[PDB]
Write a protein that binds this ligand. Structure first.
Ligand SMILES: NCC/N=C1\N[C@H](CO)[C@@H](O)[C@H](O)[C@@H]1O
Ligand SMILES: [Br-]
Ligand SMILES: [Br-]
Ligand SMILES: [Br-]
Ligand SMILES: [Br-]
Ligand SMILES: [Br-]
Ligand SMILES: [Br-]
Ligand SMILES: [Cl-]
Ligand SMILES: [Cl-]
Ligand SMILES: [Cl-]
Ligand SMILES: [Cl-]
Ligand SMILES: [Cl-]
Ligand SMILES: [Cl-]
Ligand SMILES: [Cl-]
Ligand SMILES: [Cl-]
Length: 836
């Protein structure tokens, strides 16, 4: 790219519990905890009861060191920077007897000039990590009150004082692992003349005819003299130059600001998943001095995103318009993928994006108790067409608002805005998760003096209604900012539901039936959710078979919701027969979570345009645990993930039965209108036998981006109460020529009320390396089948589906660990097997 040399400081690291003078080898980027685990100086933190056994670690201070060689030629480079991409969190950095930095913010990268401090030969870098606990005890003692951060699992709520991942202190799906370390990469760059400190591609306008861009560079020149240079930007697509521009300058010592306009005639637009291809241009900036001294590139998607948050007859809208088109959001809330962030590999990031894309998602919310994600996460979002909703890292509690605290926050906002603002995927910023709801509704006015309450409320505006929005206005001025999610709507106050986004915790916390999701509608569902135990092979990762009970000591470690296990059973009983075995209860809870949550995702699409988005709580897990996730910590799709895929299909046939009547909707998020369509339905008993005749509705159109009712029939005079216990509605949609575009199955009763016949799902298997093809068959309906394998992370073409009477079904299972002639264990469960 340029004449610079980059040296990665990622080997030869050692660490030491401070005070012990004992050093061991370490892995950087990494965490104190992993370094310990690696030397069997800690038990597996995720196993059994080990959570209390690992806590002493947050009480110690930790030291890291490494050495490296610098040559005489390297020392003669004009400039040399040490970059820390992340230090978790209070870290005194020493190089060659010099204090370079007293770091205090996990979310900020630090760029340090070090040429004057480096030595020909060996060079020594020592980092001292103060315990974030010990560091902040004096700060808490001075405070004279404990902030109400309930997810901070300690008597003293020290999380609020530290710019450090909130979930690291614990969360209602998480293990408390208050860790430290060089958590992102350390690099040394030897260079001449200058570096590009920032390259921002600012889009000025975009139409079908022309994109106009402004390339804004910040160049830090490190030499004393004036340096003539030419600044060049190359725009290319798939390896071919689309435009080139250049500018003559003379660079002065210190910072230089350079602006180059550029246009792309007839731009190829970036579109979200479902609406086209996520086209990314390559924008390359270079500083040329008679030598390319510095270069920086971004991949750039040309699109418009506008969040429309406007007064209207229903209250206040909250939706996304993408390239001019209202786009119904389909997605989920994302949390950190591990208790130990640097453990998450490229592959795990890649598979997670495959999981979102395969489930037809077009949006992910990076919720405010995690981190601002790494550059890879956003690159993946860009290339998968996944819009990103970015919370700032504040969740559930009020925070300090003193000048020093606000200076630290300003630093991280400026850092991460500039870091992330070139991503096509980045759709909006949100100041916090639920802090205004908390201050309004969670009873603080009874827990604090009126004086401290008032300081909390003034402290809110300082940060969320002034500092954060001004910073966005300055550094990302065409991106939407909202102070909090949910901004106004509260789940207990129906009057508020037509105003902005909702977190509807009526289901789950409010104990409301899944059917409440059909009546209790938001403008945009930014959270709603339901727990499940993960499958058996995940339980066996943390629990020995002795412990396989809901309420074992090992189980209950792994349940961070203290009302959780009881709600699951309560809800199961409403809709399913509760199984006697632990294994079968786990199976039915997967089915339960999946069926209830998809009924909600359907209600939200069905009720477009009133509702314009749904993001379920939650996508993923940071460790082996019972949670609201649709994908467990090992990558295994729960029922919910297959059900989200189906509920989010571009065209969906949605039968909805209420008041002893059936309605059928056709729901499209396609950009084209379908014409001359035929919906066809027939009632089929559980042995395979059609009941009555096929029902036809011809001449249907399905306009782009609409939900419409095309069929209603009362159940009375159609099916007896007995038929409803014994049959199902099969539904297909086809074009004029009879080509199937969609299908659905509908049951008229709750599963516990169905007369399921006893039955055997048989299968043939054809197994090769990396692959099994299974062919399944049952003469009678088999309800909600679970094809279970002991192979962690095995992927399925389908699972958690109804095997219909006498209808063969192909299922492909893939995994790098599938060996030809080591026959894959397969256990097939279905509802009827679960009770006798
Ligand atoms: N305040 C409870 C509702 N909100 C949420 N539910 C999740 C599960 O309770 C929790 O992990 C997040 O904080 C989220 O914002
Ligand atoms: Br320097
Ligand atoms: Br200190
Ligand atoms: Br520098
Ligand atoms: Br300048
Ligand atoms: Br605001
Ligand atoms: Br009904
Ligand atoms: Cl408004
Ligand atoms: Cl809306
Ligand atoms: Cl990274
Ligand atoms: Cl108080
Ligand atoms: Cl006061
Ligand atoms: Cl409806
Ligand atoms: Cl894993
Ligand atoms: Cl229904």
């Amino acid at each position: 790219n340029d004449t610079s040399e980059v040296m990665l400081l990622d080997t030869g690291w050692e660490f030491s519990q401070s005070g012990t003078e004992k050093w061991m080898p370490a892995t950087v980027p990494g965490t104190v905890h992993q370094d310990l685990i690696s030397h069997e100086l800690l038990p597996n933190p995720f196993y059994g009861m080990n959570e209390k056994k690992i806590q002493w670690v947050e009480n110690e201070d930790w030291e890291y060191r490494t050495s490296f060689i610098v040559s005489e030629e390297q020392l003669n480079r004009d400039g040399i920077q040490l970059i820390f991409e992340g230090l978790d969190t209070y870290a005194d950095v020493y190089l060659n007897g010099s204090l370079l930095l007293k770091a205090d913010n996990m979310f900020v990268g630090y760029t340090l000039p070090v040429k004057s401090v480096l030595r020909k030969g060996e060079n020594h870098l020592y980092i001292y990590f103060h315990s974030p606990i010990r560091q902040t005890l004096p700060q808490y003692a001075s405070n004279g009150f404990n902030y109400p951060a309930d997810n901070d699992h300690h008597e003293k709520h020290l999380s609020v004082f530290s710019r450090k991942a909130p979930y690291s202190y614990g969360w209602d799906w998480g293990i408390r692992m208050v860790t430290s370390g060089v958590w992102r990469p350390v690099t040394l760059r030897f260079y001449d003349i200058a570096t590009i400190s920032d390259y921002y591609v600012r889009q000025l306008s975009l139409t079908d005819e022309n994109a106009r861009l402004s390339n804004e560079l910040i160049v830090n020149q490190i030499v004393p003299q004036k340096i003539p240079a030419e600044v060049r930007v190359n725009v290319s697509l798939n390896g071919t130059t689309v435009t080139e521009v250049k500018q003559q300058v003379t660079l002065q010592p210190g910072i230089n600001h350079i602006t180059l306009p550029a246009e792309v005639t007839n731009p190829v637009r970036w579109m979200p998943n479902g609406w086209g291809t996520p086209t990314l241009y390559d924008f390359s900036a270079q500083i040329a001095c008679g030598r390319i001294v510095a270069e920086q590139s971004h991949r750039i998607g040309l699109r418009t995103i506008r969040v429309v948050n406007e007064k209207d007859k229903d209250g206040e809208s909250f939706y996304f318009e993408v390239n001019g088109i209202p786009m119904f959001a389909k997605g989920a809330n994302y949390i950190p993928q591990d208790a130990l962030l640097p453990n998450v590999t490229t592959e795990r990031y890649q598979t997670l994006f495959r999981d979102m894309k395969e489930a037809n998602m077009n949006m992910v919310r990076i919720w405010g108790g995690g981190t601002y994600e790494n550059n890879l996460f956003y690159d993946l979002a860009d290339e998968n067409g996944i819009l990103v909703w970015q919370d700032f890292m504040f969740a559930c509690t009020p925070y300090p608002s003193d000048p020093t605290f606000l200076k630290r926050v300003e630093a991280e906002a400026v850092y991460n805005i500039r870091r992330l603002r070139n991503h096509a995927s980045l759709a909006m910023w949100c100041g916090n998760n639920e802090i205004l709801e908390a201050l309004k509704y969670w009873g603080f006015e009874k827990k604090f003096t009126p004086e401290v309450y008032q300081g909390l409320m003034h402290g809110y505006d300082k940060l969320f209604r002034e500092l954060l929005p001004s910073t966005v206005k300055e550094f990302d001025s065409d991106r939407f900012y909202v102070h909090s999610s949910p901004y106004l709507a509260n789940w207990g106050r129906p009057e508020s539901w037509g105003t902005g986004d909702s977190h509807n915790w009526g289901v789950w916390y409010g104990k409301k039936p899944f059917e409440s999701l059909d009546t209790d509608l938001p403008r945009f569902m930014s959270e709603f959710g339901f727990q499940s135990f993960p499958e058996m092979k995940t339980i066996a990762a943390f629990a020995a078979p002795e412990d396989y009970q809901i309420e074992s000591e090992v189980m209950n470690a792994h349940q961070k919701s203290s009302i959780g296990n009881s709600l699951i059973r309560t809800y199961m009983e409403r809709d399913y027969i509760i199984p006697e075995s632990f294994e079968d209860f786990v199976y039915v809870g997967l089915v339960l979570q999946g069926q209830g949550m998809r009924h909600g995702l359907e209600a939200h699409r069905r009720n477009r345009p009133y509702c314009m988005g749904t993001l379920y709580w939650q996508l993923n897990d940071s460790w082996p645990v019972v949670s609201w996730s649709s994908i467990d910590y090992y990558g295994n799709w729960k029922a919910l993930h297959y059900q989200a895929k189906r509920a989010f299909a571009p065209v969906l046939i949605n039968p909805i039965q209420q008041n002893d009547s059936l309605s059928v909707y056709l729901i499209s998020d396609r950009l084209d209108t379908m014409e001359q369509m035929t919906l066809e339905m027939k009632v089929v008993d559980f042995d395979g036998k059609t009941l009555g005749k096929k029902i036809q509705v011809h001449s249907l159109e399905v306009p782009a981006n609409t939900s419409k009712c095309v069929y209603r029939a009362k159940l009375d005079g159609w099916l007896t109460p007995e038929d409803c216990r014994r049959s199902f509605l099969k539904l297909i949609l086809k074009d004029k020529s009879g080509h199937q575009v969609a299908e659905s199955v509908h049951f008229f009763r709750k599963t516990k009320d169905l007369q399921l016949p006893p039955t055997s799902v048989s299968y043939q298997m054809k197994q090769t390396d990396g692959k099994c093809e299974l062919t399944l068959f049952s003469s009678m309906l088999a309800k909600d089948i679970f094809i279970e394998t002991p192979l962690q992370g095995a992927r399925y073409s389908d699972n958690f589906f109804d095997l219909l009477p006498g209808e063969r079904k192909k299922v492909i299972i893939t995994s790098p660990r599938i060996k030809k002639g080591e026959e894959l264990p397969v256990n097939i469960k279905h509802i009827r097997e679960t009770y006798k």
